[PDB]
Write a protein that binds this ligand. Structure first.
Ligand SMILES: N[C@@H](CCCC[NH3+])C(=O)O
Ligand SMILES: N[C@@H](CCCC[NH3+])C(=O)O
Ligand SMILES: N[C@@H](CC(=O)O)C(=O)O
Lengths: 438, 429
């Protein structure tokens, strides 16, 4: 039958109760064959986080001290869990071995990866599934990059040959056989990898929210869930940037046609958003997929006599922005003028020196600054390229009496970006949603 | 005190000189005059300034240039002859042949076009000839302080005066030619010095029009235009000619030598020009560009991805009009002719230094810039424009606005250019 592969995040394994939710989800569908765990999430704001505490042990070892006070809390964390779940195992055998390894000079990467490992070994028992260490099945190369062709070969050999298997998350083996952890991707990528390697049908990604929403729920009331979403589509929304699964995490799935379903461990019935492939997603005829804005931006408007004739005028301008840790969002231009739209935190403090260097090299006539802009990105495949689709957005914004301060449509076929006064941000986003939902 | 510039077309020949006289003594206040060298009479005709550079070229190869100079001297002696002016123009011409053949600079040569026309003007119009070299000065760049001193002394002390206008004296007293606004800058320079009330720029067109008459039948005339609009409407005309008058009150007034009754248009300061909320000032376009679509995984997290791309564009003779960018893509809008021949070399270079998942070339795009201060903070201006374009089935390939409050730029398929331009005008008229 179908081969679904599941990952559960920190919030899904914060304590014993969540684990019961995970067991529930797993034996509620026999096709949930493969399970990838994160390390226990914080259960309250001021709670300590395991992985961090692990690193800290390694710090004691670098510093030539015991870390017995620290490792108490770890074992304490993990013994309460396997106790409350009343599981037939001796977790100390695992903890005790980890402690030793660390104080006998284990790498940081080894140290911090044990949060996922321990959850792995617990879950294999608790869910009656074969435990398969990551270090056996995921491999890196000489530079430090993910060796694809090998890992999958191994996955097919070791993982798809099991009926039900747990596979810990956040790490694999380095070229030299020693434990290497991912730098970007967390337990999500390892989930994607496994799916790729097993040729899974679905990769369920279990979190604490029932998919993604069409808009910010603080702003719009009771906003629809995004039934379906392409990768390119999602990427556009990710940047602007709604709290959504990052590109880093899903590159292995992307090559093959493996759909991801974002799902909620605390409301499993709730259907997900279903992140499809570009050529695997259909195209709803003239419609919005999502609306995602970010506040706090400032434009640097640069009027210059025949700016259009001379070459390298702009090249000089962002050679200067490269000279600091400051990226630009957009470079809207006119006939003999050009702007730079730049986020405020990215500009914080540095602003002043930058205006001077451009004045030296480029030699404009006017150089003003106008802050208090926000950006609203409205995204969808079906607006690519529908008639009057930007006009529909401007009609909306006209009805709410809100002055437009930037338009970009042209950067991307599935995306119109509108820039407006920061006061009007929430008003705009509202207006555009209503425009497309009855 | 009304200063006046006359362009080469307005001095192309004796008949045009007559027209100029008719204008000048139909207003006592037209007290000061700047001519250009004579424009071309027909399209095949030679152009005196260029002939002057050509003599300079013969001297650089140490060959005579009599054939060329015969053509210039003939050109000028005919004007005075036809005008029946009692002067000895050969006095002036012969001196010019000598200086040129005595290794004089190209700037000196080119200047003679308007110098010579100037001494002629003095007579026809009966005004005191004031060489620009003795009044407009440069440093070691324009010497604002020193020149204005000499203008009040030498010019302002005259009832009528003629100052030729494509040049002045350099630091070391040599002749120097404006690299920038021709005779239009002289007219402004004088206008400031001689603290004028109006500056008439006399062209062969009765001001500017809201849109191209080729495209919209009988377009309204642009009575008043701010400096900032004018620039932003450059697709239709100067900026480097206009600096000095900016800080002045002095309004420029573009006017028609062949139709002096026409009020023309009036280039105003931004603070002087009034703002009509919900109005356009003009619509202007240009129609052979190509967009280069470039796509990449995490384009924006790269180290100066765009910098690198237009660095590559910097190392060729390619100026671009717009750079749309976002998330995981970037576009370059480059004028077809500016791209001519260099295209495939450019594709590789960026394909080399960058990681492009994809590169496509979409040509056939024409830009339309609709402009006016009255679309400043006003709601619905975009919306008014684009409803117009929807109505008429014009597919929009790019919208760019954000560089200026008083300008939206649409990109349409070149076939829809006229249709679009017409539509926008109709929307606001
Ligand atoms: N042509 C300029 C940019 C002009 C932007 C405004 N039209 C360049 O290549 O740097
Ligand atoms: N700031 C980026 C460009 C981002 C434009 C949006 N994709 C760079 O340095 O090239
Ligand atoms: N044609 C002159 C300008 C002018 O006199 O209008 C030049 O050489 O720039």
């Amino acid at each position: 039958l179908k081969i679904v592969v599941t990952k559960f995040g920190g919030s899904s394994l914060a304590d014993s109760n969540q684990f019961k939710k995970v067991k529930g989800i797993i034996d509620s569908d026999a096709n949930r064959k493969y399970i990838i765990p994160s390390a226990p999430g914080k259960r309250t704001n001021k709670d300590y986080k395991i992985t961090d505490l692990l690193y800290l042990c390694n710090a004691h070892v670098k510093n030539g001290i015991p870390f017995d006070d620290v490792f108490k809390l770890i074992s304490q964390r993990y013994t309460e869990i396997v106790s409350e779940l009343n599981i037939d195992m001796d977790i100390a055998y695992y903890l005790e071995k980890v402690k030793k390894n660390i104080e006998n000079g284990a790498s940081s990467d080894y140290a911090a990866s044990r949060g996922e490992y321990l959850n792995g070994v617990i879950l294999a028992k608790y869910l009656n599934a074969e435990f398969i260490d990551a270090a056996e099945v995921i491999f890196f190369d000489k530079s430090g990059c993910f060796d694809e062709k090998k890992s999958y070969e191994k996955i097919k050999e070791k993982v798809l040959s099991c009926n039900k298997a747990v596979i810990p998350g956040f790490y694999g083996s380095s070229f030299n056989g020693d434990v290497k952890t991912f730098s970007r991707g967390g337990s999500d990528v390892t989930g994607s990898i496994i799916s790729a390697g097993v040729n899974a049908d679905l990769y369920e990604n279990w979190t604490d929210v029932s998919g993604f929403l069409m808009a910010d729920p603080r702003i719009v009331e009771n906003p629809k869930t995004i039934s379906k979403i392409s990768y390119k589509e999602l990427r556009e929304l990710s940047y602007m940037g709604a709290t959504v699964l990052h590109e880093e995490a899903i590159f292995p799935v992307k090559d093959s046609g493996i759909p991801i379903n974002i799902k909620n461990t605390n409301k499993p019935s709730d259907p997900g958003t279903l992140i499809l492939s570009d050529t695997h997603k259909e195209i709803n005829l003239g419609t919005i997929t999502g609306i995602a804005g970010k506040k706090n931006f400032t434009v640097i408007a640069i009027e210059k006599a025949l700016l259009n004739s001379e070459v390298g005028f702009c090249r000089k301008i962002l050679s200067i922005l490269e000279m600091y840790g400051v990226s630009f969002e957009h470079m809207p231009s006119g006939v003999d003028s050009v702007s730079l739209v730049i986020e405020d935190c990215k500009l914080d403090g540095k602003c002043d020196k930058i205006i001077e260097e451009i004045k030296k090299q480029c030699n404009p006539d006017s150089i003003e600054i106008h802050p208090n802009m926000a950006l609203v990105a409205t995204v969808g495949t079906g607006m690519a390229k529908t008639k009057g689709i930007a006009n529909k957005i401007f009609t909306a914004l006209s009805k709410e009496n809100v002055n437009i301060r930037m338009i970009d449509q042209g950067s991307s076929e599935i995306n119109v970006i509108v820039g407006v006064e920061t006061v009007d941000f929430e008003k705009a986003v509202k207006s555009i949603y209503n425009a497309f939902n009855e």
